[PDB]
Design a protein around this ligand. Sequence first.
Ligand SMILES: Cc1[nH]c2ncnc(N[C@@H]3CCCC3(C)C)c2c1C
Length: 167
Amino acid sequence: VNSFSGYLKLTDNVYIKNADIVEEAKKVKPTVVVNAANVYLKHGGGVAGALNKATNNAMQVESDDYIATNGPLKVGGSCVLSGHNLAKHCLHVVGPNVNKGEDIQLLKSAYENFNQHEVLLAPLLSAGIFGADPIHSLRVCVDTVRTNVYLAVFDKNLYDKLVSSFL
Ligand SMILES: Cc1[nH]c2ncnc(N[C@@H]3CCCC3(C)C)c2c1C
């Protein structure tokens, strides 16, 4: 039993809710919140911009030190950093950004990072400003993640379409 509330159950391990991931993280304080990161951990917009704003830019400060030490992530890769005031940990996961020409096949690799964590709060990878079809992202999530994932979908209209079209 965990503290996630109001989710529709899609499969044995995948749950979904129309929610602002920032407000959901602040309420649940999950062990792991997933960020929709880029390889530079530049949290300017989309989910990343919103999460970073909620940490008062502390996420960005930590991220800049990480990059200065380690260099950029790989598309499809991830790193674990602090969750600041939102979660114990933040798993920064880089899905392919279609608006940069990146291979959508890397979306499966991106979701594989979730399997290293028993329970996660997460957005749909490569959705929103990353330009992929959120319906496809949900399909890849369901077919790749085996651990317990609680998906937050900001847009109510998109949430309803994802549910109604789910196979
Ligand atoms: C402030 C905020 N909180 C969120 N929580 C979850 N998902 C979000 N965006 C999704 C990602 C992919 C599709 C979408 C509807 C843009 C958000 C945003 C913008």
